[PDB]
Amino acid sequence: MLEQPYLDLAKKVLDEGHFKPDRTHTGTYSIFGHQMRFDLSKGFPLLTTKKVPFGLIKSQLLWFLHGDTNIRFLLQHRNHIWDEWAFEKWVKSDEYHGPDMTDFGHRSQKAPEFAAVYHEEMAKFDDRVLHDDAFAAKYGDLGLVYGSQWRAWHTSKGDTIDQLGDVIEQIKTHPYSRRLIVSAWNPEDVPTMALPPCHTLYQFYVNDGKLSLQLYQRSADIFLGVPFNIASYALLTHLVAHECGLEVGEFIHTFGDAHLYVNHLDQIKEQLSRTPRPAPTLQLNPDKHDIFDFDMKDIKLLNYDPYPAIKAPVAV
Amino acid sequence: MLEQPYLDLAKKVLDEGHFKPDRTHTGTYSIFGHQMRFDLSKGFPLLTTKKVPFGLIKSQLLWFLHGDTNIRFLLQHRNHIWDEWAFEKWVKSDEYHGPDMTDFGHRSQKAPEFAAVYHEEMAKFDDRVLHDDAFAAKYGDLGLVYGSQWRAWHTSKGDTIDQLGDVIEQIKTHPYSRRLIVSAWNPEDVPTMALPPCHTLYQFYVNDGKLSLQLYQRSADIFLGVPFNIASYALLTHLVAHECGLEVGEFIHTFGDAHLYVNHLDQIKEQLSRTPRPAPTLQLNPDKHDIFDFDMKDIKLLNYDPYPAIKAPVAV
Ligand SMILES: C#CCN(Cc1ccc2[nH]c(N)nc(=O)c2c1)c1ccc(C(=O)N[C@@H](CCC(=O)O)C(=O)O)cc1
Ligand SMILES: C#CCN(Cc1ccc2[nH]c(N)nc(=O)c2c1)c1ccc(C(=O)N[C@@H](CCC(=O)O)C(=O)O)cc1
Ligand SMILES: O=c1[nH]c(=O)n([C@H]2C[C@H](O)[C@@H](COP(=O)(O)O)O2)cc1F
Ligand SMILES: O=c1[nH]c(=O)n([C@H]2C[C@H](O)[C@@H](COP(=O)(O)O)O2)cc1F
Description:
homodimer, Thymidylate Synthase, Chain A, six-stranded mixed beta sheet, 20% strand, binds 5-fluoro-2'-deoxyuridine-5'-monophosphate, methyltransferase
């Protein structure tokens, strides 16, 4: 079945896992080291044992897949996953001056009155962004995010290398090469960023005509973060092979610290009260080949019958 | 037993492996994706089923572990593993002008007369290096090799980040962090190098006082290259914990393309005619703490009873 992978990763953590403090409060139960593997020939591992929502996953990928470091496309696609860091880079400073708000969010996962401000002054924020190009360009252009990492490596001699572009042009001409990597971890930049890229390195592979991919994710939350991650990189592979004219092999997903949060383990146990159903299947439009173009009307997920969605608290 | 890992990786390739052309002639049998794991508490995985030689492994590590991009320390330590690329960057050019030699080596693994030249003009090379500082500094300073990758990241704003230094100072103060990485893959530099770093990324981990490490190696030869690699990173971990005052956890070693060469598979089958013996145990001197200092008289391997060494041809 395609998603038993997750359920044996998540099972093995609350069984083998050993406790660690984190970079917040809530403890983690962590394993270090896992290869999880999915056979893309017969699927698209979006969890049938918990609604996970393909729409925000597509948007986010597509944002990444064509330069963007600016949340104004994400906002205007009803997606707000990367919304708050834009507010941290602003609540703090010199145009804004308003509410209490310096530090919000965690103290809004359980708040005071906070909800009508963290939700209403960072409403006004995300609004001005979508309509004020000036404002968009500043407090909504996040800088360094996977988008500028894959498509824009800033180099010691002035300019930017579009790495993923180059690896999709190697996939075509030179298929069998052991070099087919996109790193997202740049040292000049990591004694700095809010989050360093959690999705560090991913190499690709052809062999027999179908493209595998492997992703080393350095820090992974078992419950909330790992559902989107399997699916995104699975969506990213389906898209590279429709470009490079290849079939689908594997999506292999490796880990450093796969960790569960102690504040959401009653909830993972409830997910294991469910048996996986038949796995869903994606569609990508034939009339669009340069993967760089896809809108939402170019990737269709079909026949996803999920079990009810299970809620958990971003403490980060 | 600690090295059955290798023998089930190497077994699984000539069994599951599927054929691929490479960046040379000789075909490969390759798997893509493996986590291999060793429990350093009870060992030091140097193969007992084939002599592998700790001396050249120590030298090479130590070279790496204190700035060097120059083979004059490697030469003067009777090690010549990185010797020939120094000769390719020279056979080719303007001080040298001598023998036929432009392209040598492969055509010396099976040569014409080649042996008394590839071996005698690149004798004269490695000699002048060890005695002529001028010459050392040029045709023996390899530039970018793991040494300048770990200890010298060249940055867009002028200077060099000593990454490994910084990660050993984080290991001390902040132990439990999901950030403890040293990448060796720099994009500005990889549309270029002879070999891109085969040992791309490695993150570390404490938890309960003993340090694990995990290495994603992008391209690995099963037979010749993978023996040194398990041991080096195992030696590298033993050294970080004696610095950071930690015990030893695991050494986890992940793969992209683990591949065997078709020209050395009679030879791997002969290694599997042997049962592993008791695994060897290393020593690191108590009076030397800054790992940055170790000479050869600071790491002792004890009680390594190996099976005879099994020879195989560098075609690259
Ligand atoms: C990328 C990026 C930046 N971020 C920020 C961020 C903050 C805390 C985190 N916490 C955990 N455990 N994992 C994460 O991936 C994570 C990411 C993201 C923002 C939201 C979601 C997300 O949709 N969360 C839940 C929604 C339910 C809820 O909390 O109310 C989900 O659908 O699973 C994922 C990533
Ligand atoms: C690092 C680096 C650069 N290099 C260059 C280089 C060239 C061809 C290769 N071929 C293979 N299969 N794997 C490699 O790691 C490799 C590396 C190295 C040079 C020598 C050895 C080595 O000692 N080889 C054999 C020696 C026996 C022989 O060939 O006569 C061994 O001990 O296993 C390893 C790495
Ligand atoms: O440190 C090294 N490791 C390594 O394994 N090789 C070789 C053999 C390996 O199989 C190949 C990597 O494949 P590619 O041909 O893509 O470089 O280079 C060379 C080195 F310098
Ligand atoms: O893309 C992302 N992935 C991710 O998982 N996180 C979170 C949750 C994860 O557990 C943590 C990574 O650990 P660290 O605290 O070391 O950053 O950051 C945030 C993102 F933006």
